[PDB]
Amino acid sequence: SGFRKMAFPSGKVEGCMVQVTCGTTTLNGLWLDDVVYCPRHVICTSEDMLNPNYEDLLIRKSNHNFLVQAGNVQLRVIGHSMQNCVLKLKVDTANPKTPKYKFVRIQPGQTFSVLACYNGSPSGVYQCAMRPNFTIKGSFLNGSCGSVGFNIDYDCVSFCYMHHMELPTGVHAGTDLEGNFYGPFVDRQTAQAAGTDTTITVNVLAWLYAAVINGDRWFLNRFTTTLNDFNLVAMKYNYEPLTQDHVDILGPLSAQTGIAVLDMCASLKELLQNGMNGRTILGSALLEDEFTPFDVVRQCSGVTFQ
Amino acid sequence: SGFRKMAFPSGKVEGCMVQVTCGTTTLNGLWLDDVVYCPRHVICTSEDMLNPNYEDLLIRKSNHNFLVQAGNVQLRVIGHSMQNCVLKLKVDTANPKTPKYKFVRIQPGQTFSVLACYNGSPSGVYQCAMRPNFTIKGSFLNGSCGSVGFNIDYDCVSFCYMHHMELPTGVHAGTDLEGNFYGPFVDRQTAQAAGTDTTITVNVLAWLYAAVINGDRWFLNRFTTTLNDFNLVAMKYNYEPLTQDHVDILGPLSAQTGIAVLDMCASLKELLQNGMNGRTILGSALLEDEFTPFDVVRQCSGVTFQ
């Protein structure tokens, strides 16, 4: 038993991390087949970040201006192109560690594992959720740009995130592996605001089901509610509106624990209006919203990967 | 910036996980050089766990009674021996993925990464702390036994934990890689109690330094205190007694932030007596004690691994 914030095994993604140097900027790249993917602001100086014209800045760059390093071994760059906010560097060598992979654009509320790197070397791994305002609350120091977020199913790594920016609020923004930013963010050092951060209501509910599964039942109440009435309570506390889809997704968890989704919605309503009174749920004094319903089922079953 | 519960990259340990079957019991093993390490209760049936005589149970076992599987490939067992609570199975093939490795016995309060596995396949990775009562709060389902905990420095994996038991309280116990249990626990299905769980005081302090580093300063007070007087407060709240060694270990964090250790001890005293008043520190409404001072320095610097 027990329930934990858990990350996918990072072994497949580690064999894909390289070091990318352009001029005096060094960051991380992702080496799949004979292409290296990295944030396009590798071509920027510290001053260029204040207002970069990437097209013009890239005109002055050639293939031999990109230093791609895997271990002590340099890759030969034969071509380069800018797809949105990522640079695609064609190299002469397919990555012999290329796993089965996909590029996916996740939705708000979905989770993924981040393999934080510096100079192409993996430093650590942790779980992150795509906040409804398309930010993430991660851990990114200078040089972590290019670190990727991913999900694994069986043998397939689903790459979904690449780190590009830290916002003046301290939260993080990035793109998918096609270069399109999550949210209204741009790769410029200027004042950009995330929207109102709201709570992923369906994730809190799955976390409450995981709590009931593991013995934490003190919050189960004698009340029940409706979808509209629960939602009317959810707006006051900046919770994402719950829908029938969210209800459907929680069905398996409802079936195992025998607690109707609308019941758990009512137990959540009591927690929102009365607090936790100094108690904890799965060792937390807050309401966790970074576990999807699928994350709960995986941990409560034992899914493994090849 | 940002601060996160982070686990080491698991790629090196993944290439060491195998499946071990003895009779009808299947669990995980660790394949280093030409030896497989696994919990000795792989030789037990469900009834044997109630009172096992491992010596006698092992007499009836031969080398060909151990099914060791790496992928679709079986290992040939040439020898077997029982070191305390782990079984050492000599195989005819050195692991070609054997990394530089060490067997270490960590101390209470130290942290490590757990690569949870089922049937020799890695399922996930998360961080754990050796509680002062030598338990760990992990995530372990049926078949996770044999999953290992480790730390990485440069190229060296320091194996320190192997999972063997879930306690009737839902917490977890295991051995080092020489088979010696952490704590007074035995590999028997009987009532065993952990001691009073206490809080790792030096870990809370390093976490408070990490908070100040990342902008959370609302808890910094105008008071200071002594070691004895702070400790007198720590016993009431079941905190581990703080020593000069703990003070010394926090020196680097004291030096960077310019806050004396005894000051932070006084800010902790106010948090213990007045609570958090509904505020959060690094996104938590509790006082986290599973980050060592070294874990904080690593994240606030960017240490990487080869």
Q: Which residues of A touch B171 (CB under 8 A)?
A: 2
CB pair distance less than 8 Å for B125 and A302 = no
* Dist CA A147 CA A122 (whole Å): 9
Q: Which residues of A touch B301 (CB under 8 A)?
A: 141
Residues forming a β-bridge with B116: B124
Q: Which residues fall within 8 angstroms of residue A88, CB to CB, at 6 or more apart?
A: A35, A36, A37, A80, A81, A82
Token code pair at residue A44: 């920027």
**Structure-derived torsion over alpha carbons of residues A88, A91, A97, A100, reported in degrees to the nearest 10:** 40
What phi and psi values does residue A218 have, to the nearest 5 degrees?
-65, -20
**E-assigned strand segments in A63-188:** 66-70, 73-75, 77-83, 86-91, 100-103, 111-118, 121-129, 148-153, 156-166, 172-175
* Dist CA B103 CA B87 (whole Å): 15
CB pair distance less than 8 Å for A7 and B124 = yes
What phi and psi values does residue B208 have, to the nearest 5 degrees?
-70, -35
Q: Which of B107, B268, B283 is nearest to A5 (CA)?
A: B283
CB pair distance less than 8 Å for A15 and B11 = yes
Of A12, A124, A304, the CB nearest to B7: A124
CB pair distance less than 8 Å for B126 and A5 = yes
Q: Are A297 and A203 within 8 A, CB to CB?
A: no
Provide the residue type at A276 as one letter: M
What phi and psi values does residue A142 have, to the nearest 5 degrees?
-65, 120
* Dist CA B270 CA B257 (whole Å): 19
Strands B35-39 and B156-166: unpaired
* Dist CA B215 CA B2 (whole Å): 9
> Cα–chain-centroid distance for residue A281?
24
What are the C-alpha distances in Å from B124 to residues A151, B2, B38, B264?
11, 23, 19, 35
Q: Which residues of B touch A172 (CB under 8 A)?
A: 2
- HEC-encoded secondary structure of chain B: CCCCCCECCCHHHHCCEEEEEECCEEEEEEEECCEEEEEHHHHCCCCHHHCCCHHHHHHCCCHHHEEEEECCEEECEEEEEEECCEEEEEECCCCCCCCEEEECCCCCCCEEEEEEEECCEEEEEEEEECCCCCCECCCCCCCCCCCEEEEEECCEEEEEEEEEEECCCCCEEEECCCCCECCCCCCCCCCCCCCCCCECHHHHHHHHHHHHHCCCCCCCCCCCCCHHHHHHHHHHCCECCCCHHHHHHCHHHHHHHCCCHHHHHHHHHHHHHHCCCCCCECCECCCCCCCCHHHHHHHCCCCCCC
Measured at the CA of B222, the angle between CA B272 and CA B242, to 5 degrees, comes to: 45
> Cα–chain-centroid distance for residue B257?
29
Token code pair at residue B243: 């020593």
Resolution value in angstroms: 2.1
* Dist CA A96 CA A298 (whole Å): 30
Q: Which of B203, B208, B207, B210 is nearest to B2 (CA)?
A: B210
Of A6, A118, A284, the CB nearest to B302: A118
CB pair distance less than 8 Å for A124 and B170 = no
Across B222-232, b (16+ Cβ under 10 Å) vs e yields eeebebeebbe
CB pair distance less than 8 Å for A2 and B172 = yes
Q: Which of A204, A275, A266, A196 is nearest to A238 (CA)?
A: A196
* Dist CA A96 CA B218 (whole Å): 50
Q: Are B199 and B289 within 8 A, CB to CB?
A: yes
CB pair distance less than 8 Å for A214 and B9 = no
Nearest residue in B to A304, CA atom:
B123
Provide the residue type at A149 as one letter: G
Strands B156-166 and B100-103: parallel
Q: Is A64 a catalytic residue?
A: no
Q: Which residues fall within 8 angstroms of residue B176, CB to CB, at 6 or more apart?
A: B103, B104, B105, B160, B161, B162, B182
- Residues, chain B: 306
Q: Are A147 and A7 within 8 A, CB to CB?
A: no
Residues forming a β-bridge with A88: A37, A81
Give A62: exposed, middle or buried? Use CB within 10 Å, 0-12, 13-18, 19+. exposed
Provide the residue type at B86 as one letter: V
| A-B contacts at Cβ under 8 angstroms | 159
Of B9, B124, B143, the CB nearest to A122: B9
CA distance A62 to chain B (A): 30
Token code pair at residue B73: 């490939």
What are the C-alpha distances in Å from A220 to residues A217, A251, A281?
6, 18, 12
Q: Label residue A267 left, alpha or beta by phi (over 0 means left) and psi (-120 to 50 means alpha).
A: alpha
Q: Is A172 a catalytic residue?
A: no
Token code pair at residue B49: 């766990």
- Residues, chain A: 306
Q: Catalogue the long-range contacts made by B11-14 (C-beta closer than 8 Å, 24 or more residues apart).
A: B11/A9, B11/A10, B11/A11, B11/A12, B11/A14, B11/A15, B11/A122, B12/A11, B12/B97, B12/B99, B12/B152, B12/B157, B13/B99, B13/B115, B13/B122, B13/B148, B13/B150, B13/B157, B14/A9, B14/A11, B14/B115, B14/B122
Of B7, B144, B298, the CB nearest to A126: B7
Q: Which residues of B touch A298 (CB under 8 A)?
A: 123-124
Catalytic center residues of B? 41, 145
**Structure-derived torsion over alpha carbons of residues B21, A157, B2, A165, reported in degrees to the nearest 10:** 170
